[PDB]
Design a protein around this ligand. Structure first.
Ligand code: CU
Length: 128
C-alpha cells in the first residue's frame, strides 16, 4: 500500500493530488486512476502519464497531436515512463511500473495529456 496510490481526475479538470512519493524499496509501483464526475472520455478524458519534468512538454505536445484514438499519446513515446489509458467518468484504470526506471535527485512529472488538461492536471513525482 506504500507501493501504490489512488488518484482521481474529476469533471473540473483537476487531479486530487499534485505530489507523489515513491519509496525506494518498492520494486514496483502502482497508480490507480479513477474519474468521478459525469463527463465522457471524449470531453473530459483523463490519463495518468509519467515522464521526467524536462520531457513533459514534449510528451504533452506530441500526445495532443496524436488524437483521441491514440489516447492522446504518441505511440511508443520513449519519454513516457508509464501511463494509464485515457478514461471518462465512472471508469478507472491502473498502471504498474518498475521503480528502477526512476532515480534519486531527478524531478518527474505526472500529467494528463488530454488537450489543455496539463495546465492544471500535473504534479511532481519523486523517488525516496
Ligand atoms: Cu484529463
Amino acid at each position: 500500500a506504500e507501493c501504490s496510490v489512488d488518484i482521481q481526475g474529476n469533471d473540473q479538470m483537476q487531479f486530487n493530488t499534485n505530489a507523489i512519493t515513491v519509496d525506494k524499496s518498492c520494486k514496483q509501483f502502482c497508480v490507480n486512476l479513477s474519474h468521478p464526475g459525469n463527463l465522457p472520455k471524449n470531453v473530459m478524458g483523463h490519463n495518468w502519464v509519467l515522464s521526467t519534468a524536462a520531457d513533459m512538454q514534449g510528451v504533452v505536445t506530441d500526445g495532443m497531436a496524436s488524437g483521441l484514438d491514440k489516447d492522446y499519446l504518441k505511440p511508443d513515446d520513449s519519454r513516457v515512463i508509464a501511463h494509464t489509458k485515457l478514461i471518462g467518468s465512472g471508469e478507472k484504470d491502473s498502471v504498474t511500473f518498475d521503480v528502477s526506471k526512476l532515480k534519486e535527485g531527478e524531478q518527474y512529472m505526472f500529467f494528463c495529456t488530454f488537450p489543455g488538461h496539463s495546465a492544471l492536471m500535473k504534479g511532481t513525482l519523486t523517488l525516496k
